Amino acid sequence: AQINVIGQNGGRTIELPLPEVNSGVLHEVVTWQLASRRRGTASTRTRAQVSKTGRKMYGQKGTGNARHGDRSVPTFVGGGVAFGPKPRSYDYTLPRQVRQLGLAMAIASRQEGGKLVAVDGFDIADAKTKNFISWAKQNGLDGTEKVLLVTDDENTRRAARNVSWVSVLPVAGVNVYDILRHDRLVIDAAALEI
Template identity: 45%
Template sequence: MKVQVLNLDGSAAGDVELADDVFGLEPRADILHRVVTWQLENRRGTARGARERSDVARTGKKFGRQKGGGTARHGDRKAPIFIGGGKAHGPRVRDFSVSLNKKVRALGLKMALSSKAQNGLVVVDSLELTDAKTKALAGTLAKAGFGKKVLVVDGEQVNEGFARAARNIVGVNVLPAIGANVYDILKHDTLVLTRAAVEKLEARFNG
């Protein structure tokens, strides 16, 4: 698949050949859903449990007479109504992490890239900026017409000047190629890859 390469200002800078086994697959909603669910579930921390009645170390001795004391008929200081007693119906320890086959995870990323290749993929030559300022970069991106939610993926490392300039632009996120993931790709309207990012992503699957 041949795609035109642009400069950051939107002008043409040649062509690049994209591997069909990475960018030319037919996306499947079920695979993408499984990978996104796996990502979001693994972001959740383990739920912290509360100590319930059986977990509290207090006396179980009946501490008053059954009748005549002028109080209710309590038989245990671990009851939830007492200070220091167990929590009634408290949260339980739950682990939300799920496992997913590596091949499915890799297939999901390929399909996410393929879905953007069909609509929403831009390949740029590099992220080098002559003026690495937020205001200048915001104007450049607006002129290029990349949209409001843009994910920019660079090669081994993100260009430092570009990352610093893009840090305060709402809707623009920057990642190195190793950090490319299905959830972030699908969440943004436009995926911007550098030539180096294309090489890294293709090598990631073919290496």
């Protein structure tokens, strides 16, 4: 039930998720997402096998005050680790219903406050990066917020490059994380929208 910033109207479509903004599902979603991103890289020599050591030692019974088999065991120094990390995945598929329920619930979570849909990007005028600051100031972005821009038109994205103000998300490749992370979501391009 929402306005467009330039040109047309619409966005009175899109029934938002019920109840409005359930944060549990949100948490589930993002957690899944970071978990998807998580890259297992494990530098561990677990086994007494991994590290380099010859394996027969010295006398068993009869040396006294001793008791050992080998130098590669985890009770030794320099040896293997008992239960260290190995190269795993931890990537799964969260059920798709929730995969699409989430981002909707995010956009919904942007209805307690500011969000925006745009058309007519010609106010950018190539890139120049300056006219993006302008466009923002005229469209109400102090740049004291954090902003995510979702649009096509490479000319239009590439106007925005900076840490302070904004971040860019092409071709409606949107992330529940990315939009929930930033303060303002500029939904911009009305393609995936409406």
